[PDB]
Amino acid sequence: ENSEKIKVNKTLPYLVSNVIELLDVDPNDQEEDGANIDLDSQRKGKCAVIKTSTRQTYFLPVIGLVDAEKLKP
Amino acid sequence: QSEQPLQVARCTKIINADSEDPKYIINVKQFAKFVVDLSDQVAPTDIEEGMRVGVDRNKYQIHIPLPPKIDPTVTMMQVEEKPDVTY
Amino acid sequence: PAVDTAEQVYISSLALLKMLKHGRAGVPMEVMGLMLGEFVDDYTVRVIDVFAMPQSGTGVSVEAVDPVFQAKMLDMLKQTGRPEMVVGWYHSHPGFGCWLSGVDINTQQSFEALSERAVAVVVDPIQSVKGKVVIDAFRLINANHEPRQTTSNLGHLNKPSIQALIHGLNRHYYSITINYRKNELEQKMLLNLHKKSWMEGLTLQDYSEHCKHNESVVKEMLELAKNYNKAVEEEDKMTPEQLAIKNVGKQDPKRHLEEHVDVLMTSNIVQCLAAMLDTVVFK
Ligand SMILES: [Zn+2]
């Protein structure tokens, strides 16, 4: 079922983009529950900054379905 | 009956074909670049690398190959109508 | 078998303040919590308090992380005098107005399945301003006819917003009027909040600073009077339409003179009266 979900969420039309950076980010301080965000904090891995072919830059707290170490600027 | 059934395709230029399975990178002029699939009408053999293909505005899938872009100043060199002189 | 349109949801001042504070704290997210209250009659759903719950999510969704907290909180409030049980849930839409999305509708479906008359309240912090708070209460419509019966005009007094209508109002859910009934002590405390200490009223104001302020304002009024003289000579060599756009990007000496006059009069009258009152009261 999970593989089916991944396939249906990977609808074919993609938007080519270039990986500007692979930043390293770490949590800052304690975040009060009730309002805590999984992106601004609780994210210790590698984050990507990409530039879409539409000339739009974007920050990716979760890289996606491609392992970070493979991507290079 | 031409505006109802005949949709509007957008000119693009194929750049790469990925794998045996159809997956085409296109470069819509001054709009964007996409990884796109074919339509049921167009056969895979019709599309080659570097040729111009029209794509629909919703899913950006190829619908028709188009003739190569040629300079007007070189396309006007063709004779078209030939002279009436003979040997 | 009716659910009437004159039904109202009574939100306490405490509940409203808690909702707005939590929503504003979670400005990018849809922070959420439970509402405790009673189902008095078929024309009232009293909301007396709300408590936030441990939750975590992104700017596209928010979900609760533990139900043990909810159960324990209900028990430990009952132990201190709040036997009321959950009657709905509240979550904040920061800037999108007031309405329910698909996930919101699913949560409200679960709450409806538990209790028939459970309601959902959407409070938008950032669009709220001092005078008005943007808040609405909702309930769902089954797959059927009219969702409710009208036995009064009370329901049809709100003019539902275009954004809510676009996002599904009167088609997948209907609104319920929110009322802010208060008790005597709540009214008195709200009125007393802004009351200042008595000594502050009789306290005078440094005379050096007072004279300096008066001098500054009079000096400004001098230049304003020059400009006013210049402006009065106009208004005859001016098109009836040109006068309106004449005061665009340029100072208005008349308006500024009036404002300065008002401020000076208030300050000086207050100071003189306070001085005399103190002169008599204190020997
Ligand atoms: Zn929502």
Question: At which residue do the structure tokens 């111009």 appear?
Answer: B52
Final residue belonging to a domain, choices C128, C158, C191: C191
What stretch of H or E contains A49?
strand A46-52
What stretch of H or E contains C202?
helix C198-202
What is the C-alpha separation between A7 and C25, in angstroms, rounded?
A: 37
Contact C155, C175 (CB under 8 A): no
- Residue C281 domain-assigned? no
What is the C-alpha separation between C111 and C88, in angstroms, rounded?
A: 7
What is the span of the domain harbouring residue C271?
Answer: 202-276
Which among C120, C143, C164, C156 is positioned nearest to C9, based on CA atoms? Answer: C120
Q: Can you name the residues that pair with B52 across neighbouring β-strands?
A: B13, B66
Whether residues C83 and C172 share a domain: the answer is yes
CB proximity A62 to C under 8 Å: no
Whether residues C94 and C44 share a domain: the answer is yes
Whether residues C172 and C226 share a domain: the answer is no
Do chains C and A touch, with touching meaning 3 or more CB–CB pairs less than 8 Å apart?
yes
Chains that touch A (3 or more CB pairs under 8 A): B, C
What is the C-alpha separation between C255 and C221, in angstroms, rounded?
A: 11
- Two tokens at C101? 């999305």
Exposure class string for C183-197: b at 16+ Cβ within 10 A, else e: eeeeeeeeeeeeeee
- Two tokens at C145? 């006819």
Phi, psi at C226, each rounded to 5° = -55, -50
Rg (CA), chain B: 17
**AA letter at C166:** I
Contact C107, C118 (CB under 8 A): no
Whether residues C173 and C255 share a domain: the answer is no
**C263 CB neighbour count, 10 Å cutoff:** 12
Whether residues C101 and C206 share a domain: the answer is no
- Residue C154 domain-assigned? yes
Q: Residues, chain A, total?
A: 73
What is the C-alpha separation between C63 and C55, in angstroms, rounded?
A: 6
Whether residues C44 and C129 share a domain: the answer is yes
Q: Where are the beta strands (DSSP E) in chain C?
A: 8-11, 32-38, 44-52, 55-58, 61-64, 85-92, 119-123, 135-140, 173-179
Final residue belonging to a domain, choices C191, C224, C242: C191
- Residue C223 domain-assigned? yes
Domain count, chain C: 2
Q: Are strands A17-24 and A46-52 parallel, antiparallel or unpaired?
A: antiparallel
What is the C-alpha separation between C38 and B8, in angstroms, rounded?
A: 59
Which of C25, C52, C57 is the closest to A38 by Cβ? C57
What is the C-alpha separation between C35 and C121, in angstroms, rounded?
A: 9
- Residue C96 domain-assigned? yes
Whether residues C166 and C213 share a domain: the answer is no
Whether residues C272 and C236 share a domain: the answer is yes
- Residue C122 domain-assigned? yes
Q: Can you name the residues that pair with A14 across neighbouring β-strands?
A: B35
Whether residues C96 and C228 share a domain: the answer is no
Residue of B nearest to A53 (CA): B32
Q: Are strands B52-56 and A56-60 parallel, antiparallel or unpaired?
A: unpaired
Chain B residues in contact with A52 by the CB 8 A cut-off are 32
- Residue C60 domain-assigned? yes
CB proximity A34 to C under 8 Å: yes
Whether residues C185 and C209 share a domain: the answer is no
Residues with Cβ within 8 Å of B19's Cβ and at least 6 positions away in sequence, in order, are none
Do chains C and B touch, with touching meaning 3 or more CB–CB pairs less than 8 Å apart?
no
Final residue belonging to a domain, choices C171, C191, C211: C191
Q: Where are the beta strands (DSSP E) in chain B?
A: 9-17, 24-28, 32-36, 52-56, 62-66
- Residue C282 domain-assigned? no
* Environment class of A36 (CB within 10 Å of its CB; exposed 0-12, middle 13-18, buried 19+): buried
- Residue C172 domain-assigned? yes
What is the C-alpha separation between B11 and B7, in angstroms, rounded?
A: 13
Residues with Cβ within 8 Å of A35's Cβ and at least 6 positions away in sequence, in order, are C22, C25, C26, C29, C31, C55
Q: Can you name the residues that pair with C175 across neighbouring β-strands?
A: C138
Whether residues C94 and C134 share a domain: the answer is yes
CA distance A30 to chain C (A): 13
A35 to C29: CB separation less than 8 angstroms, yes or no: yes
Whether residues C93 and C159 share a domain: the answer is yes
